[PDB]
């Protein structure tokens, strides 16, 4: 019925690429869950892949009203896709607990990227 939260985020792709060039998997694993890493490792544009997931998760954390804090971690969010490529967001851990407290029934996520920037928006509704 009503919107419980709204979140948006923009990420500079070159910054994510630089971080991967320096710290690689140590950096990717802080952001991605084990299930997401398979898809990540398969990509030939890993910085772009990670930039999008980073924007999506930050946008989700803001829609929750906590950001990546108060027990909410990047691993509480998992990004997947439907059969036509639409991105989907699934919550776990503290994010799932807060969503339940807020009575969230539907989650909407959209992602976009151009050469230099990735962005995402998330809406939680009850």
């Amino acid at each position: 019925a009503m919107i419980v939260g709204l979140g948006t985020d923009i990420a500079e792709i070159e910054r994510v690429e630089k971080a991967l060039a320096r710290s690689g998997e140590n950096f990717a694993r802080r952001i991605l869950t084990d299930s997401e890493l398979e898809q990540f490792h398969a990509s030939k544009q890993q910085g772009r892949f990670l930039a999008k997931r980073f924007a999506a998760k930050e946008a989700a954390s803001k829609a929750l009203g906590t950001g990546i804090a108060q027990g909410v971690t990047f691993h509480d969010f998992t990004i997947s896709h439907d059969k036509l490529g639409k991105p989907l967001l699934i919550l776990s851990g503290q994010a799932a607990e807060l969503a339940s407290q807020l009575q969230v029934e539907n989650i909407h996520l959209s992602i976009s990227d151009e050469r230099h920037y990735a962005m995402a928006t998330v809406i939680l509704e009850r």
Copy 2:
């Protein structure tokens, strides 16, 4: 009621300008309906005009859940404005058929551009 789709897109204006300098009307006509072409032709900043429409339409195609695919074309989306300048989105063709299947009753669109980027967000609600 509830949100049935969310879409967002960011477009680099310079790439649109380069495409117009090379292919002009042939490129513009792939994105714009005949009705929209009249407004486009009267514009004195065509690359900027077209980048905004491009972002709006891709955002709308993501809100429908298909992208520009599965029979959904750029011509299935028409952008107009109300008397105060608010952008309005009207669907046709396969986009309209899918929206009808999604029970879409209200469509919201917002657009913004700065010197180098144009972006848009679309929300479909039932």
Copy 3:
């Protein structure tokens, strides 16, 4: 509860910084209410602070459906924050009068910035 409006906006931070270097308070006071100026004055990154507020207010004005026109001014939008850092939008002046006529009961705002750009999205719900 349906969506009354949606607004989005992107702002180039260096343009805001340049404006401040030239016009300072004359510029800042056009965008910010006296109450918001207190927080602004305490910031050590005033250009970035102001770029975010500028984006939030422009987005809010688009969600209302008027833009910054028709008696609606930048001062009709006040950005505050909750204890966890979530941004909150409160309307006044003509914006509040119009929102009341539209039966707006819930307002949602999200803001994000990266090195060069600030962006925001606003949704008004009845």
